[PDB]
Amino acid sequence: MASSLRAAISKIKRDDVGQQVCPNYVMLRSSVTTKVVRNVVEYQIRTGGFFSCLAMLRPLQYAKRERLLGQRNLERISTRDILQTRDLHSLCMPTPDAPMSNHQASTMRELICSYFKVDHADGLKYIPMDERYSPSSLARLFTMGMAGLHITTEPSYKRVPIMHLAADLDCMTLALPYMITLDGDTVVPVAPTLSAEQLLDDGLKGLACMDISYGCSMDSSRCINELYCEETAEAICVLKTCLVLNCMQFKLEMDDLAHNAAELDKIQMMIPFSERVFRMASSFATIDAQCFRFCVMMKDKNLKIDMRETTRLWTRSASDDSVATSSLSISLDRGRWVAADASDARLLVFPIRV
Amino acid sequence: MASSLRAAISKIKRDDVGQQVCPNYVMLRSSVTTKVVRNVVEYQIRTGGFFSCLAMLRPLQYAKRERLLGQRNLERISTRDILQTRDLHSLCMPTPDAPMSNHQASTMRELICSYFKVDHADGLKYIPMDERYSPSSLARLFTMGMAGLHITTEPSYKRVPIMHLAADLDCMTLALPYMITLDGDTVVPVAPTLSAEQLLDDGLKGLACMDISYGCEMDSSRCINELYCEETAEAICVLKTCLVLNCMQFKLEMDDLAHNAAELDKIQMMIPFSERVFRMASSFATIDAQCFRFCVMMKDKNLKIDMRETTRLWTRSASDDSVATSSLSISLDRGRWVAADASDARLLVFPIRV
């Protein structure tokens, strides 16, 4: 009565919260439940990883529940038999089996070392010599650090100074990042011309022209840039950097999903998924040029697109001449960002919760 | 034609929100507003000072709006021609026109100095050479200091380090303070034998036998003493000291309300003001012996008592032999402090908000 195939199947993980799409990723990690009402099937998509990554714009809230978890969980996670990308993300480690980045890796390592007052050998555990890192793991590292917790290289939590900006923002419940320019004594929203990564170039200088409007569509609005002083400067740069890093991870994973046929075939032209991807990309449409051009294109096709054509658009949106911008003029009111072409609304980006 | 009476009456600021009761006080500052439905008039008592100063148990929440306000408001308060007690409390100054103490004032100033790393002479401004200080102004100073803000001697907000305990506790919506004893490897709640003031003795080491159970909903309970380590020790000592300071201020003002017949005649009639005084004293009934006894008494008289008799019971409650507390067994269940004589529940103390 014993058989080999049954033994193979026995080992397979049968949690089955839903149809697991793009696991082994950080932000594109997705679950598809099926919900039937009458005779119509509504696919319900749960992408918690992305939404947790975006909640880092409020560091004390990101950290809130985990700071009351002892040094036990980190030590459990590391001792585990097989470490998935989620496990390594919790430890702020390089995530093999997931896309990674080699961009400004030394400046990023130098930042770990300066912020956390740590050695280069320790820096090399976060960002190895292959120079390849996972940007979201690195954001988690810094986001927690602003909240007063350093994830150490031995799985441990060490107490580090809590950033005043994190406490100053913790009241806020909505946020909108955008790009600005200074045309002399006045500040105006501008469309993203550079890519999120290129903000990291030149020692993170281009970050000065990103702003984030925090508020409670929104009210009691406070911009991060008006809270700039000598003491909050570092905290503002890190916050903006973590945002950029999460954007980079998104882009990396999307670029990889364009070529990962296994998971793309698994998505049976779910329009629900392609409008999810539109939400996710809209988060960064105000700070990354590619995601801008991508979101304008999909909204031009009324978001009734299957994932194949969708991640075809992603591939094309990496090039400046894929859509015409110069034409578009952008304004910001009531906490949402609008790009319009001669009174035609080409993209509307709403603020993100937490 | 003109009148000097008219001119005098003209100069009187008329906020007239209600009948103001015990102004020039910190915690007993009250306002009665008359609400009528049918032919029944019900008196509503607002006592926001008391509940504000107990909200200090969660320091970041106490600081939440005030950290967004600039140094503008503190200068503005100091400029005011008539410095009322309310304004002085905002500035963490000593409060004439209101009661004060001298208990361990030397160790308090040394604490101010230690925590805020400030010289003896400006610490003399907070606690003068008179040796008299307002305990609640001092609790505010320290409470804001855990939140990362120092109210300086010149009106000014100076950024100091934010305590990790303040961040740890900020998810908690309820708190129950109580006293404990260590019998072997089991902690048990005990009745308050000492005075609040007497916990400031023995180099504040007596505070270790106090615990505060924080929770939500209670449900997600944590005891502050569970969170003790050498990094959290300072914060735990200050948080406990600030509670003792607010207790002491409460006591100082009650004693004063005993001899202040000028206010007590005005509120001699209202049973709702007895309910409020019971609610207040119940907050410290677990950590102060007088407040314990006082609260046991009024529960015996079923809370239907006038304020004259009320504050006479207060004056009596100062004496150990006034009620027979030795037969009462103390239990802490459902987030709820119970003092009972066999099957008779002589006092129930409930968790405090924030």
CA distance B57 to B169: 9
SS3 B212: strand
Q: Note whether A71 and A59 are within 8 A (CB).
A: no
**Please, is B205 exposed, middle or buried when counting C-beta atoms within 10 Å of its C-beta (0-12, 13-18, 19+)?**
exposed
Q: Between β-strands A174-182 and A149-151, what pairing exists: parallel, antiparallel or unpaired? A: unpaired
CA distance A197 to B303: 68
Phi-psi region of B16 (alpha: psi -120 to 50; beta: other; left: phi over 0): left
The CA–CA distances, whole Å, from B132 to A142, B83, B248 equal: 46, 18, 13
The CA–CA distances, whole Å, from A160 to A118, B103, B147, B161, B335 equal: 12, 35, 15, 10, 32
CA distance A236 to A252: 24
The CA–CA distances, whole Å, from A11 to A8, A15, A21, A136, A260 equal: 6, 12, 20, 30, 25
Structural Rg of chain B based on CA atoms? 21
Nearest Cβ partner of B231 from A64, A159, A168? A159
Nearest to B51 by CA among B209, B276, B311: B276
Dihedral angle, C-alpha A8, A9, A12, A17, nearest 10 °:
170
Inter-chain CB proximity B147 and A167 less than 8 Å: yes
CA distance B140 to B88: 11
B133: DSSP letter:
B
* Torsion sign (Cα): B193, B198, B201, B207: positive
CA distance B292 to B253: 17
B161: DSSP letter:
P
CA distance B43 to A4: 80
Q: Residue A344's beta-bridge partner residues?
A: A341
Helices (H) and strands (E) in chain A, counts: 15, 13
Burial A143-153 (b: 16+ CB within 10 A, else e): bbbbbbbbbbb
**Which parts of chain B fold into alpha helices (H)?**
4-11, 48-54, 59-63, 72-79, 85-90, 105-116, 120-126, 135-146, 164-169, 196-199, 233-259, 261-264, 271-284, 289-300, 307-317
Inter-chain CB proximity B164 and A167 less than 8 Å: no
Which long-range contacts link A32-39 to residues 24+ away (Cβ below 8 Å)?
A32/A270, A32/A273
Q: Find chain B residues with C-beta within 8 A of A168's C-beta.
A: 67-68
Q: Note whether A329 and A340 are within 8 A (CB).
A: yes
Nearest to B191 by CA among B6, B330, B26, B5: B330
CA distance A275 to A236: 31
Provide the token pair at B287. 């950590």
Residue with tokens 């364009």: A258
CA distance A209 to A250: 21
Nearest to B280 by CA among B191, B196, B349: B349
Which are the contacts of B351, defined by CB distance < 8 A and separation ≥ 6? B174, B175, B176, B213, B215, B218, B335, B336
CA distance A34 to A38: 13
Provide the token pair at A245. 């890093």
H or E element that contains A338 = strand A336-341
Q: Note whether A294 and A317 are within 8 A (CB).
A: yes
CA distance A108 to A236: 16
Q: How many CB atoms lie within 10 A of CB A102?
A: 10
SS3 A176: strand
Sheet holding B344-349: strands in order across? B329-332, B337-341, B344-349
CA distance B335 to B326: 23
Find the farthest-apart pair of alpha carbons in chain A and give their distance in angstroms, rounded.
82
Q: Which of B159, B164, B165, B232 to mutate to test the interface with A (most CBs of A within 10 A)?
A: B164
Nearest to B174 by CA among B143, B144, B213: B213
CA distance A29 to A136: 13
Residue with tokens 């929104």: A218
CA distance A324 to B77: 56
**Which parts of B117-189 fold into alpha helices (H)?**
120-126, 135-146, 164-169
SS3 A328: coil
Provide the token pair at B198. 């007497």
Structural Rg of chain A based on CA atoms? 21
Q: Note whether B147 and B166 are within 8 A (CB).
A: yes
CA distance B319 to B305: 20
Dihedral angle, C-alpha B241, B245, B251, B253, nearest 10 °:
180
**Which parts of A147-195 fold into alpha helices (H)?**
164-169
B288: DSSP letter:
-
CA distance B56 to B70: 20
Q: Note whether A252 and A100 are within 8 A (CB).
A: yes
Nearest to B190 by CA among B202, B199, B181, B198: B181
Single-letter residue type at A43: Y
Q: Between β-strands B210-215 and B174-183, what pairing exists: parallel, antiparallel or unpaired? A: antiparallel
Nearest to A286 by CA among A342, A216, A211, A208: A211
Q: Note whether A313 and A284 are within 8 A (CB).
A: no
A122: DSSP letter:
H
CA distance B213 to B177: 6
Q: ∠ at Cα A331 (A252, A342), nearest 5°? A: 100
CA distance B104 to B195: 13
Nearest Cβ partner of B159 from A67, A159, A231? A231
Residue with tokens 């269940």: B333
Phi-psi region of A333 (alpha: psi -120 to 50; beta: other; left: phi over 0): beta
Q: How far is CA A204 from the centre of its chain?
A: 18
Q: Residue A111's beta-bridge partner residues?
A: none
Rounded to 10°, the helix A233-259/A196-204 angle is 140
Nearest to B87 by CA among B119, B18, B134, B19: B134
Residue of B nearest to A227 (CA): B68
Residue of A nearest to B69 (CA): A168
Q: ∠ at Cα B124 (B119, B107), nearest 5°? A: 85
Single-letter residue type at A62: Y
Give me the count of residues in chain A.
354
SS3 A222: strand
Helices (H) and strands (E) in chain B, counts: 15, 13
Inter-chain CB proximity B159 and A60 less than 8 Å: no
Phi-psi region of B104 (alpha: psi -120 to 50; beta: other; left: phi over 0): left
Q: Find chain B residues with C-beta within 8 A of A64's C-beta.
A: 170-171
Phi-psi region of A97 (alpha: psi -120 to 50; beta: other; left: phi over 0): left
Inter-chain CB proximity B170 and A64 less than 8 Å: yes
Q: Which of B60, B158, B162, B226 to mutate to test the interface with A (most CBs of A within 10 A)?
A: B162
Give me the count of residues in chain B.
354
Sheet holding B19-21: strands in order across? B19-21, B30-37, B40-46
Inter-chain CB proximity B168 and A67 less than 8 Å: yes
Q: Find chain B residues with C-beta within 8 A of A60's C-beta.
A: 167, 170
Single-letter residue type at B215: G
Residue of B nearest to A223 (CA): B68
Resolution for this model in angstroms, one decimal place?
A: 3.0
Residue with tokens 């709640």: B189
- One-character DSSP codes across B136-150: HHHHHHHHHHHTTEE
Named by the residue before each, gaps in chain B exceeding 2.5 A from C to N are 217
CB pairs under 8 A between A and B: 46
Q: Find chain A residues with C-beta within 8 A of B169's C-beta.
A: none
CA distance A16 to A266: 15
Residue with tokens 């099926």: A34
Q: How many CB atoms lie within 10 A of CB A275?
A: 16
CA distance A224 to B79: 31
End-to-end CA distance of chain A: 56
The CA–CA distances, whole Å, from B329 to A101, B321, B335, B340, B350 equal: 64, 17, 16, 5, 17
Minimum distance, in Å, between the CA of residue B178 and any CA atom of chain A: 22
The CA–CA distances, whole Å, from A61 to A53, A58, A143, A353, B186 equal: 12, 6, 10, 12, 34
Q: Find chain B residues with C-beta within 8 A of A161's C-beta.
A: 161-162
Minimum distance, in Å, between the CA of residue A120 and any CA atom of chain B: 26
CA distance B285 to B191: 9
**Which parts of chain A fold into alpha helices (H)?**
4-11, 48-54, 59-63, 72-79, 85-90, 105-116, 120-126, 135-146, 164-169, 196-204, 233-259, 261-266, 271-284, 289-300, 307-317
CA distance B330 to B333: 10
Nearest Cβ partner of A162 from B65, B67, B164? B164
Nearest to B21 by CA among B54, B52, B56, B49: B49
Provide the token pair at B331. 């239990």
Which are the contacts of A166, defined by CB distance < 8 A and separation ≥ 6? A58, A59, A60, A146, A147, A235
**Please, is B121 exposed, middle or buried when counting C-beta atoms within 10 Å of its C-beta (0-12, 13-18, 19+)?**
exposed
CA distance A12 to A29: 18
CA distance B250 to A246: 50
Q: Find chain B residues with C-beta within 8 A of A156's C-beta.
A: none
Q: Residue B332's beta-bridge partner residues?
A: B337
Nearest to B327 by CA among B313, B347, B311, B312: B347
Nearest to B140 by CA among B27, B35, B232: B27
SS3 B215: strand
Rounded to 10°, the helix A196-204/A105-116 angle is 60
Q: Note whether B103 and B197 are within 8 A (CB).
A: yes
Provide the token pair at A124. 């090399």
Q: Note whether B101 and B107 are within 8 A (CB).
A: no
A260: DSSP letter:
-
Minimum distance, in Å, between the CA of residue A86 and any CA atom of chain B: 25
Nearest Cβ partner of B67 from A60, A161, A168? A168
